[PDB]
Amino acid sequence: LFPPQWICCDIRYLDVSILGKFAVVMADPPWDIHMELPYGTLTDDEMRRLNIPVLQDDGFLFLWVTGRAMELGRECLNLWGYERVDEIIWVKTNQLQRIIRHWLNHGKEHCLVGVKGNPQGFNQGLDCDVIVAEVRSTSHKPDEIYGMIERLSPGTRKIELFGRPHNVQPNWITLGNQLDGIHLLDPDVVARFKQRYPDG
Amino acid sequence: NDYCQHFVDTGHRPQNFIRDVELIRLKDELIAKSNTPPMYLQADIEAFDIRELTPKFDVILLEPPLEEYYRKCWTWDDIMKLEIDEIAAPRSFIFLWCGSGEGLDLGRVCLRKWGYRRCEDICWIKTNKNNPGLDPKAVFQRTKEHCLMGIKGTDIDLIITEEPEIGNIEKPVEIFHIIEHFCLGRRRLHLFGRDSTIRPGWLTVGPTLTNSNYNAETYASYFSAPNSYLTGCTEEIE
Ligand SMILES: O=C([N][C]C1=[C]N2[C]=C([C][N][C][C]3[C][C][C][C][C]3)[C]=[C]C2=N1)C1=[C]C(=O)N2=[C][C]=[C][C]=C2[N]1
C-alpha cells in the first residue's frame, strides 16, 4: 500500500503521460449540466478531448454520470476507446436506512464501468453492482467504491480525475484543482515531473 | 456500515437492508374511472405489420424477451428494427425494459432511433433475502434491471422486490403504477405483454397471448370527442 498522492492542477493542461499507467481510472467530472451550477464545469469538447487514452494499456474506468451525462459519458467512454461492461447504481439511504430525494425524485446515482484491452488478475464478480450508503457528504461519492475497486484490483496503481481533497486514498494519485498543492512520493513520477515541469 | 463489504462476507446484497419498501387514493380511483376495458391481441410482432394498430399511442411499454432473461427470443438486432416511431403519438412516452447488459446502451440507441429522448432511468433492484449468495464480460454480480423512460414532443426511480425464482421472466407491476400515476394519456400499449400482464386501461399485444378481444374501430371508439385528450387521471365527461 502507498500513501495518498495528489496534484492540484487544471486537468486540461497537465501532461498526464509523466504519471504512466493505472489498472483503474476513476473520474467524478463536473459535467456541464447547464443548470448555471455553483462550481466550475467543463464543456463537452473539453471532456471529449480529455487525454484519458494515455493512462491505461489494459484495465477499467469508473465514470460517474447524471442527467444528460448518462448519454455523454457513454460517448466519452466510447471515444476514449472503452466498452461499458457494468453500470453501478448508488442508493442513497438516511441514517435510518430509508431512501432519499426528470419526472421522478432521484433515489440513486450511476457510475458507468468501462473496460479497455485485455485486463487480467482482476477478481471479477466479487462485489455486486448496487451500493447502499448514507449521503454523508454534499456532492461526493461513497467510500464504498474504493472498497469495491481494491477488492477488484488489489495493490495496483490507481488514478482519479476531478477528485477533491477527501477522495485521496492509498494507492490513488488524485488530480483536481481543489487539492492543497502537490504531494508525490513514487520516485519514478517525482523524476518524470521535475524534468517535465522544471519549476512546477 | 459497508453493505458491499458485507455482501462479500455473506451474500446479502446491500439492497437486502433497505428498511421501508395524505394518500394518493383519488388519483388511483380517477385512473380507474378513466381506464378503458383491458384489450389484447395475440400477434407475432416480427411477422406483423405494426401500422395495423391505431390510433397512435400516448404511452408504450416495451418488454421484449431478451436472450439474457434465460440462464422465440429477441436480440437488440431484432428490437432495433421495430418501427415504434410509426405508432407513437407526436407527444408520446415509452418505457423500454433493457436488462443489465448491452441493453443499457442499445436501448438508448433504440430511443434516439424512434425519436425519443431519455429523461428517466428506473431501476428494478432485486433482493436475495430468501437466497443469500454472470456473463464473462461483466465485472460485478448484476442485481438489477433497467427501464428507460423516453419522451417525444416537448413516485421515485427505484423498484425493490425479491429476485424472481430464476427463469420466471415477469417484471414488477410497480412499473404500471409509475406509468399510470404520470397521467400521460388513455391510449396505452404493452408490447410483448402476456396473458398474465393484461390490465384495464391497456392494449396488451404479444405472441404468447392465448385469446384476442382487439378491434381497431372499437378501440378507437373509446377516445372519440369528448374523451380523446383526457389524461387518464381526469374524470370522464357525462
Ligand atoms: O478538480 C476539479 N473538479 C472538482 C470537482 C468534481 N466535481 C464533481 C461533481 C459532481 N458530483 C457527482 C455526484 C453525483 C454522482 C455521484 C457522485 C457525486 C461536482 C463538482 C465537482 N468539482 C476541476 C478540475 C479542473 O481542471 N477543472 C477545470 C475547469 C473547470 C473545472 C475544473 N474542475
Side-chain angles (χ1 to χ4, degrees), chain A residues 168-187:
Chain A
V168 304
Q169 308 267 47
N171 293 10
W172 283 86
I173 306 169
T174 303
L175 311 185
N177 63 20
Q178 279 161 217
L179 307 155
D180 228 333
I182 297 88
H183 180 33
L184 280 177
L185 293 184
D186 176 10

Short mmCIF file of all heavy atoms in Angstrom, two decimals, chain A residues 168-187:
data_model
loop_
_atom_site.label_atom_id
_atom_site.label_comp_id
_atom_site.label_asym_id
_atom_site.label_seq_id
_atom_site.Cartn_x
_atom_site.Cartn_y
_atom_site.Cartn_z
N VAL A 168 -8.85 11.43 -1.52
CA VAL A 168 -7.44 10.97 -1.56
C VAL A 168 -7.34 9.70 -0.73
O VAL A 168 -7.77 9.72 0.42
CB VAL A 168 -6.47 12.07 -1.09
CG1 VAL A 168 -6.63 13.35 -1.89
CG2 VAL A 168 -6.61 12.34 0.40
N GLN A 169 -6.85 8.62 -1.32
CA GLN A 169 -6.79 7.28 -0.71
C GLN A 169 -5.45 6.62 -1.03
O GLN A 169 -4.81 6.94 -2.04
CB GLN A 169 -7.96 6.42 -1.21
CG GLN A 169 -9.33 7.07 -1.06
CD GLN A 169 -10.04 6.71 0.22
OE1 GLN A 169 -9.48 6.75 1.32
NE2 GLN A 169 -11.32 6.39 0.10
N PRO A 170 -4.97 5.70 -0.18
CA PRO A 170 -3.82 4.87 -0.52
C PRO A 170 -3.90 4.28 -1.94
O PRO A 170 -4.97 3.90 -2.37
CB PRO A 170 -3.88 3.77 0.55
CG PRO A 170 -4.47 4.46 1.75
CD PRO A 170 -5.46 5.46 1.19
N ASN A 171 -2.75 4.24 -2.63
CA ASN A 171 -2.55 3.64 -3.98
C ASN A 171 -3.07 4.58 -5.06
O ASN A 171 -2.76 4.34 -6.26
CB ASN A 171 -3.18 2.25 -4.08
CG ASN A 171 -2.48 1.25 -3.18
OD1 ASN A 171 -1.66 1.64 -2.36
ND2 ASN A 171 -2.81 -0.03 -3.34
N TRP A 172 -3.78 5.64 -4.65
CA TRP A 172 -4.50 6.56 -5.57
C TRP A 172 -3.75 7.88 -5.65
O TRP A 172 -3.71 8.64 -4.62
CB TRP A 172 -5.96 6.80 -5.12
CG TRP A 172 -6.93 5.69 -5.40
CD1 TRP A 172 -7.17 4.60 -4.63
CD2 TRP A 172 -7.86 5.61 -6.50
NE1 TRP A 172 -8.17 3.84 -5.17
CE2 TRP A 172 -8.61 4.43 -6.32
CE3 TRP A 172 -8.12 6.40 -7.63
CZ2 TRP A 172 -9.60 4.03 -7.22
CZ3 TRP A 172 -9.11 6.01 -8.51
CH2 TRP A 172 -9.85 4.85 -8.30
N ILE A 173 -3.27 8.20 -6.84
CA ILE A 173 -2.97 9.60 -7.23
C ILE A 173 -4.29 10.26 -7.55
O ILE A 173 -5.08 9.65 -8.27
CB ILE A 173 -1.99 9.66 -8.41
CG1 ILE A 173 -0.72 8.86 -8.12
CG2 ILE A 173 -1.69 11.12 -8.78
CD1 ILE A 173 0.17 8.65 -9.31
N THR A 174 -4.54 11.41 -6.97
CA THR A 174 -5.76 12.21 -7.16
C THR A 174 -5.38 13.51 -7.89
O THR A 174 -4.48 14.19 -7.41
CB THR A 174 -6.44 12.44 -5.81
OG1 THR A 174 -6.69 11.15 -5.25
CG2 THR A 174 -7.73 13.23 -5.92
N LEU A 175 -5.97 13.77 -9.05
CA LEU A 175 -5.81 15.04 -9.80
C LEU A 175 -7.09 15.84 -9.66
O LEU A 175 -8.17 15.20 -9.69
CB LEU A 175 -5.52 14.76 -11.28
CG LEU A 175 -4.43 13.74 -11.57
CD1 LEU A 175 -4.16 13.65 -13.04
CD2 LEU A 175 -3.17 14.09 -10.82
N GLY A 176 -6.98 17.16 -9.64
CA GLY A 176 -8.07 18.08 -9.30
C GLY A 176 -7.53 19.45 -8.91
O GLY A 176 -6.37 19.54 -8.42
N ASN A 177 -8.33 20.48 -9.12
CA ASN A 177 -7.91 21.89 -8.96
C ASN A 177 -8.28 22.39 -7.56
O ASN A 177 -8.24 23.59 -7.36
CB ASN A 177 -8.53 22.75 -10.06
CG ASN A 177 -10.04 22.79 -10.00
OD1 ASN A 177 -10.64 22.50 -8.96
ND2 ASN A 177 -10.67 23.18 -11.10
N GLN A 178 -8.67 21.51 -6.63
CA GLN A 178 -9.08 21.91 -5.26
C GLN A 178 -8.27 21.15 -4.22
O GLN A 178 -8.68 21.15 -3.06
CB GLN A 178 -10.57 21.69 -5.09
CG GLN A 178 -11.37 22.83 -5.68
CD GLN A 178 -12.80 22.44 -5.93
OE1 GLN A 178 -13.40 22.85 -6.91
NE2 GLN A 178 -13.33 21.59 -5.05
N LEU A 179 -7.15 20.59 -4.61
CA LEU A 179 -6.23 19.85 -3.72
C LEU A 179 -5.17 20.83 -3.21
O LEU A 179 -4.84 21.78 -3.96
CB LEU A 179 -5.62 18.69 -4.51
CG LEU A 179 -6.63 17.77 -5.21
CD1 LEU A 179 -6.00 17.09 -6.41
CD2 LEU A 179 -7.19 16.74 -4.25
N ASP A 180 -4.73 20.66 -1.96
CA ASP A 180 -3.73 21.54 -1.28
C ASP A 180 -2.34 21.22 -1.87
O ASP A 180 -1.60 20.37 -1.31
CB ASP A 180 -3.80 21.42 0.25
CG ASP A 180 -3.82 22.75 0.99
OD1 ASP A 180 -3.28 23.74 0.44
OD2 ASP A 180 -4.40 22.80 2.14
N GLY A 181 -2.06 21.81 -3.03
CA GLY A 181 -0.74 21.83 -3.67
C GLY A 181 -0.44 20.54 -4.40
O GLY A 181 -1.23 20.14 -5.27
N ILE A 182 0.73 19.98 -4.14
CA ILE A 182 1.22 18.72 -4.74
C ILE A 182 1.82 17.90 -3.62
O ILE A 182 2.54 18.49 -2.77
CB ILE A 182 2.23 18.99 -5.87
CG1 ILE A 182 1.61 19.76 -7.03
CG2 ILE A 182 2.86 17.68 -6.34
CD1 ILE A 182 1.68 21.27 -6.88
N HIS A 183 1.56 16.60 -3.64
CA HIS A 183 2.14 15.61 -2.71
C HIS A 183 2.45 14.34 -3.49
O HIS A 183 1.51 13.63 -3.82
CB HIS A 183 1.18 15.37 -1.54
CG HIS A 183 1.71 14.39 -0.57
ND1 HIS A 183 3.07 14.27 -0.31
CD2 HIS A 183 1.10 13.46 0.19
CE1 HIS A 183 3.26 13.32 0.57
NE2 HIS A 183 2.06 12.80 0.89
N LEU A 184 3.71 14.09 -3.78
CA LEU A 184 4.16 12.96 -4.63
C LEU A 184 5.30 12.22 -3.94
O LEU A 184 6.07 12.88 -3.23
CB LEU A 184 4.59 13.51 -5.99
CG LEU A 184 3.46 13.81 -6.98
CD1 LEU A 184 4.00 14.42 -8.26
CD2 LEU A 184 2.68 12.56 -7.30
N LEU A 185 5.42 10.92 -4.19
CA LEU A 185 6.28 10.00 -3.39
C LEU A 185 6.90 8.91 -4.26
O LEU A 185 8.07 8.56 -3.97
CB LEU A 185 5.43 9.40 -2.27
CG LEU A 185 4.97 10.40 -1.21
CD1 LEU A 185 4.23 9.69 -0.09
CD2 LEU A 185 6.15 11.21 -0.65
N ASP A 186 6.16 8.37 -5.25
CA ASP A 186 6.70 7.41 -6.25
C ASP A 186 7.82 8.08 -7.03
O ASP A 186 7.57 8.90 -7.90
CB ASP A 186 5.64 6.92 -7.24
CG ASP A 186 6.22 6.02 -8.32
OD1 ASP A 186 7.39 5.64 -8.19
OD2 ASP A 186 5.48 5.71 -9.30
N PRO A 187 9.09 7.72 -6.74
CA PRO A 187 10.24 8.47 -7.25
C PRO A 187 10.21 8.56 -8.79
O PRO A 187 10.49 9.63 -9.32
CB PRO A 187 11.45 7.65 -6.76
CG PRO A 187 10.92 6.91 -5.54
CD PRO A 187 9.49 6.59 -5.89
#
